[PDB]
C-alpha cells in the first residue's frame, strides 16, 4: 500500500471568533430602514451558544483530521501542552477558544490562555491600537487610495449595484434617513446620503459613511443567517446571488483597510512572529501566555481583520465556495509544517478551513465524512516548493521576515 511521503509535525490555526450578536445598535442603523432589527439572545458582540456549537463542530472535525494524520491520539486527552490555545481578551474570542477545546477534546479542560490584563487590549491582535507601532499616514493614505482606484467615490461607484441591493433589503426608500432628507430633488441613495471618506491616523484607519455602514449591515445579515434566525434581512434575501452581492460590500471594505500591505504588515507582525516561531522546530520552553512552543497544535482565537491582515501580508488570496464572507465567523487560516520522510526536509502548507453559510444555517455537524469547506492556499511569493505545492520552511521564513515590520514586533 502506497504510504504518505509527508508527515504532519505541527499545526497552527488562526481562527476568527464564531457567530455573535452585532457589536452595536446605533441610531443610524435604525434610520436606514423602516423595519426593526431582530434582537439577539446574547449581549452585543458576544458569542451565541449556537456560535459556540458551530465552533465546537470545527473542533470535532479537526480532532478527527489530526488523528488520521497521526498528530493527535484517537483516544483520551492530549498530553500536557500538546495542544495550546490562545485567545484575545474579548468575550467572544475567549468563548471561541473554549468551544474549540470542547469540540477537540470533550471534558478535557484544555486551558484557553489570554493576556493577563483582560481590561486592556492585547497588542498581539493589533499593535497599532495599543501604540506598539505606528502607521505612516502619508504612505498608508496613498496606498489605500491607489487600490481604491484613486478615490472612494470611484470605488463605490463601481459597486452601486451591490449598494442598491442593500437599499432594497433595507427598504431604504421608506426610511427616516430618506424621508427627512431635504434635497429630495434626487432619488435617495446610501452613498450619496452618507459620503464615505478615508480617515487615517497613526493607530488606525477607517472609512466613514455608506462604505463602513454597508460592510457592517451585510455582515449582520450573514450573522442572522448563520444564527438560524427565521428571516434574515426581513425575508428580502432569497438566493445565493443576493448573498454574494451583499457581502461583496463587506469584503470590499476589508480589501481596502485590512488587506492593503501598508496596513496589513504592521497589524499582522505580532501574529506573524508567533506563527513563525510556533512552526519553526526548536527546544520547547514556557513562552508568552504561559504556553510552551513549539508544540503539536496551537489554536489562536482572533478576528476577521487578523485573517485579512495575514492574507495581505503573506500575499494569500482566496474565495470560499459556499461562503460569501471571505473571513467568516469560525473561519480558520491553517498553517501546517510537514516533514518529508525521504530527506527530513521541512515544508509549510497554508489553507483556509471554513463552514459554508449553509453548514452554519443547518448547523450541520462536521466530520471527515461531512468536512467543512477547505481551500489550499499558495504563498504567492514562494519559489522553493515540493511536489504537493508546499513552501519550504526556509522559503516561508524568508517570506515572513520580509513581510513583518520589526518596529511592530512585541
Ligand atoms: O475587537 P472590537 O474592538 O470589538 O472591534 C470589532 C471587531 O473588529 P476587529 O477585527 O478590529 O477586532 C469585529 O470583528 P470580529 O471580532 O467579529 O472578527 C468587527 O466586525 P466586522 O468587521 O465583521 O463587521 C467590528 O466591526 P463592526 O462595527 O462592523 O461590528 C469591530 O467593531 P468596531 O468597528 O467598533 O471596531
Ligand atoms: Hg495561561
Ligand atoms: Hg519557543
Ligand atoms: Hg469578515
Ligand atoms: Hg466578517
The Cα 330–Cα 16 span in angstroms is 5
C-alpha to C-alpha distances, 167 to 187, 190, 233, nearest whole angstrom: 12, 7, 11
Cα 45 to ligand 4 centre (Å): 14
- For the chain, give the residues followed by a break (C–N over 2.5 Å): none
CA atoms within 13 A on the CB side of 359: 26
Ligand 1: list residues with CB < 6 Å. Answer: 16-17, 23-24, 45, 90, 216, 219, 303-305
User: In sequence order, what E strands does 312-381 have?
Assistant: 332-340, 345-354, 373-377
CB of 214 closer than 8 Å to CB of 249? yes
CB of 18 closer than 8 Å to CB of 47? yes
Please give the angle made by the CA atoms of 178, 239 and 154, to the nearest 5 degrees: 50
Residues in contact with 105: Cβ distance below 8 Å, sequence separation at least 6, in sequence order: 63, 77, 78, 83
Please give the angle made by the CA atoms of 331, 337 and 341, to the nearest 5 degrees: 140
CB of 297 closer than 8 Å to CB of 72? yes
On the question of a common fold for 1-134+259-410 and 135-258, the answer reads: yes
Ramachandran angles phi, psi of 300, nearest 5°:
-115, 115
Cα 44 to ligand 4 centre (Å): 17
* Ligand with minimal distance to 330 CA: 1
Q: Which residue has the cell 499545526?
A: 11
User: Which residues, listed in sequence order, are joined to residue 13 by a DSSP beta bridge?
Assistant: 299, 334
User: Which residues, listed in sequence order, are joined to residue 348 by a DSSP beta bridge?
Assistant: 337, 391
The Cα 281–Cα 363 span in angstroms is 37
**Among candidate residues 195, 130, 169, 102, the one with its CA nearest the CA of residue 410:** 130
Mutation probe of ligand 1 site: the residue of 305, 329, 354 with most atoms within 8 A of C-beta: 305
The Cα 74–Cα 81 span in angstroms is 17
Please give the angle made by the CA atoms of 43, 45 and 48, to the nearest 5 degrees: 65
Domain boundaries of the chain, sorted by first residue? 1-134+259-410, 135-258
| CATH class entry, domain 135-258 | alpha beta
Mutation probe of ligand 1 site: the residue of 126, 225, 267, 303 with most atoms within 8 A of C-beta: 303
User: Which residues, listed in sequence order, are joined to residue 334 by a DSSP beta bridge?
Assistant: 13, 351
Residues in contact with 81: Cβ distance below 8 Å, sequence separation at least 6, in sequence order: 284, 291, 292, 295
Length of the chain: 410
Residue nearest ligand 1's atom 17 by CA: 303
Q: Across the chain, which distance is largest between two alpha carbons, in Å?
A: 76
Burial class (CB in 10 A: 0-12, 13-18, 19+), 362: exposed
Cα 134 to ligand 3 centre (Å): 27
The Cα 218–Cα 250 span in angstroms is 6
**Among candidate residues 54, 132, 48, 149, the one with its CA nearest the CA of residue 100:** 54
CA atoms within 13 A on the CB side of 141: 9
Cα 255 to ligand 4 centre (Å): 10
Query: Which grid coordinates belong to 133?
Result: 507601532
Q: How was this structure determined?
A: X-ray
CATH superfamily of 1-134+259-410: Phosphoglycerate mutase-like (3.40.50.1240)
Residue nearest ligand 1's atom 5 by CA: 23
Amino acid at each position: 500500500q502506497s504510504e504518505p511521503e509527508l508527515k504532519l509535525e505541527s499545526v497552527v490555526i488562526v481562527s476568527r471568533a464564531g457567530v455573535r450578536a452585532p457589536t452595536k445598535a446605533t441610531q443610524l442603523m435604525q434610520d436606514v430602514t423602516p423595519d426593526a432589527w431582530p434582537t439577539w439572545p446574547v449581549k452585543l458582540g458576544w458569542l451565541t451558544p449556537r456560535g459556540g456549537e458551530l465552533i465546537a463542530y470545527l473542533g470535532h472535525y479537526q480532532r478527527q483530521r489530526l488523528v488520521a494524520d497521526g498528530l493527535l491520539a484517537k483516544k483520551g486527552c492530549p498530553q500536557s501542552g500538546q495542544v495550546a490555545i490562545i485567545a484575545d481578551v474579548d468575550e467572544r474570542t475567549r468563548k471561541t477558544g473554549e468551544a474549540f477545546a470542547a469540540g477537540l477534546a470533550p471534558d478535557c479542560a484544555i486551558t484557553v490562555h489570554t493576556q493577563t490584563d483582560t481590561s486592556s487590549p492585547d497588542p498581539l491582535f493589533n499593535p497599532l491600537k495599543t501604540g506598539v507601532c505606528q502607521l505612516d499616514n502619508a504612505n498608508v493614505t496613498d496606498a489605500i487610495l491607489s487600490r481604491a482606484g484613486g478615490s472612494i467615490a470611484d470605488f463605490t461607484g463601481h459597486r452601486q449595484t451591490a449598494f442598491r441591493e442593500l437599499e432594497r433589503v433595507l427598504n431604504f426608500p421608506q426610511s427616516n434617513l430618506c424621508l427627512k432628507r431635504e434635497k429630495q430633488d434626487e432619488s435617495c441613495s446610501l452613498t450619496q446620503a452618507l459620503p464615505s471618506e478615508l480617515k487615517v491616523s497613526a493607530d488606525n484607519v477607517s472609512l466613514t459613511g455608506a462604505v463602513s455602514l454597508a460592510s457592517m449591515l451585510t455582515e449582520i445579515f450573514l450573522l442572522q443567517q448563520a444564527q438560524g434566525m427565521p428571516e434574515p434581512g426581513w425575508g428580502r434575501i432569497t438566493d445565493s446571488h443576493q448573498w454574494n452581492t451583499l457581502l461583496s460590500l463587506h469584503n470590499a471594505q476589508f480589501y481596502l483597510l485590512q488587506r492593503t500591505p501598508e496596513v496589513a504588515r504592521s497589524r499582522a507582525t505580532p501574529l506573524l512572529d508567533l506563527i513563525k516561531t510556533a512552526l519553526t522546530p526548536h527546544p520547547p520552553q514556557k513562552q508568552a501566555y504561559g504556553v510552551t512552543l513549539p508544540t503539536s497544535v496551537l489554536f489562536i482565537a482572533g478576528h476577521d481583520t487578523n485573517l485579512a491582515n495575514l492574507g495581505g501580508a503573506l500575499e494569500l488570496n482566496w474565495t470560499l465556495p459556499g461562503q460569501p464572507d471571505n473571513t467568516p465567523p469560525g473561519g480558520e487560516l491553517v498553517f501546517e509544517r510537514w516533514r518529508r520522510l525521504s530527506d527530513n526536509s521541512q515544508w509549510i502548507q497554508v489553507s483556509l478551513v471554513f463552514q459554508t453559510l449553509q453548514q452554519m444555517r443547518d448547523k450541520t455537524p462536521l466530520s471527515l465524512n461531512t468536512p467543512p469547506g477547505e481551500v489550499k492556499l499558495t504563498l504567492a511569493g514562494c519559489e522553493e516548493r515540493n511536489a504537493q505545492g508546499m513552501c519550504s520552511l526556509a522559503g516561508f521564513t524568508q517570506i515572513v521576515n520580509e513581510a513583518r515590520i520589526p518596529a511592530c514586533s512585541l
